[PDB]
């Protein structure tokens, strides 16, 4: 058992919030889970955040830290190499909210694998925020020995982009200094050999807000202006009940709500409407605790909604009482920048084919121009949703 956490909080009234996060990287090298406050376990549940009081093992290892993550060697895969840790906080508008803006900040970390004697150990990390205006930091790295075992060093750069998944790059270059400047060697590096300078996973925390421009910007410093979006719905139910008769999973439906100055709705395109004048619904012509299939697909072409809307909220519902939202597991919404262009559905013929018929041309596949702006979702447990 593996516990890792900071703790800032001097207090646990106080409501400053930061983000330890860890992205772990197979032995092919690309990105192949992630974790944060909005998505507590990852890696079948090899990572568990510690707020979160279910989906860990009944073996119990207690910390006292404030965003502590326990990481239960045995339970990993093969292909699951390094983990890279970046501790950040959040950038809300009006305050320039840093890493440095409280009282302390420490690492801990835990090795408590062995019987007996439980490892506990106590880095610093302020004086590293300190210098300049810094919100992530990539706190330590950890990897896997061909022999077996974990190593953690500890490579630290500030950086002032908030977000993990943003630094994408930044994280692929620290694990290609790890192979190059030091001795101990990953197979994974020796097929990192391209980088990409604009790749990024989309992370979405609570109550971020971004203008769509700057979210479609990203790391590219040309702004493109936000002509159509594509926005996609998903929800997943949770296993039913063993008995009699099997009951029937619910038929949710989705509530777009276009509102103006006053106070009154607009326009409103729901599954009953399907149609108003900005916007058109649907498309043109083992158990993975996340997965993400798409429902609908509601369009939405910027310039030409009536001019008199100001807001629009996206609710999802089934208002048939006495069940609240039990049986409902997760629902999911992600926007799309897609002014300039479409992905095919994947596995669709027309996709597939034009996959085959492009050649590799020294890229997977053929780079998709619709840009992810926001992946937010909400979770649900077994029974706890009613209500």
Not at 120 to 138: E, H, R, T
Not at 178 to 198: K, N, S, T, W, Y
Not at 328 to 344: H, I, K, M, Q, Y
Request: charged share 25%; glycine share 6%; proline share 8%.
């Amino acid at each position: 058992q593996y516990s890792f956490g900071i703790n800032f909080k001097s207090s646990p009234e106080e409501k400053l919030n930061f983000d330890l996060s860890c992205v772990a990287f197979d032995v092919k090298g690309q990105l192949h889970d992630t974790l944060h406050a909005r998505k507590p376990t990852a890696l079948d549940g090899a990572l568990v955040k510690g707020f979160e009081k279910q989906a860990l093992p009944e073996e119990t290892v207690q910390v006292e830290g404030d965003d502590v993550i326990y990481m239960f060697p045995k339970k990993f895969e093969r292909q699951v190499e390094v983990l890279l840790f970046v501790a950040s906080a959040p950038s809300i508008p009006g305050k320039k909210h840093d890493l440095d803006s409280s009282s302390k900040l420490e690492f801990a970390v835990s090795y408590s694998d062995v019987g007996g004697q439980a490892f506990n150990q106590s880095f610093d990390l302020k004086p590293l925020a300190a210098q300049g205006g810094v919100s992530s930091i990539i706190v330590a790295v950890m990897y896997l020995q061909a022999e077996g075992g974990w190593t953690l060093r500890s490579v630290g750069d500030c950086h002032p982009f908030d977000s993990p998944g943003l630094i994408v790059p930044e994280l692929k270059q620290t694990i290609l200094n790890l192979r190059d400047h030091h001795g101990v060697q990953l197979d994974a590096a020796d097929a990192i050999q391209a980088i990409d300078p604009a790749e990024r996973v989309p992370v979405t925390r609570q109550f971020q807000d971004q203008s769509l421009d700057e979210a479609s910007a990203g790391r590219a410093a040309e702004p493109a202006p936000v002509k159509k979006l594509r926005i996609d719905l998903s929800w997943t139910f949770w296993p039913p009940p063993p008995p009699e008769e099997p009951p029937e999973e619910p038929a949710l439906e989705y509530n777009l709500v276009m509102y103006n100055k006053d106070g009154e709705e607009v326009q409103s395109i729901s599954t009953g409407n399907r149609e108003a004048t900005g916007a058109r619904a649907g498309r043109p012509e083992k158990v993975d605790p996340y997965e993400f299939k798409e429902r609908d697909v509601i369009y939405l072409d910027v310039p030409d909604l009536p001019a008199e809307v100001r807001s629009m909220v996206l609710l999802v519902t089934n208002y048939d009482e006495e069940n609240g939202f039990t049986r409902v597991r997760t629902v999911r919404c992600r926007l799309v920048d897609v002014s300039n262009g479409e992905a095919p559905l994947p596995g669709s013929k027309a996709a597939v084919a034009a996959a085959a018929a492009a050649a590799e041309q020294g890229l997977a596949a053929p780079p998709n121009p619709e840009r992810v702006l926001a992946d937010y979702g909400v979770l649900s447990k077994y029974e706890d949703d009613k209500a």
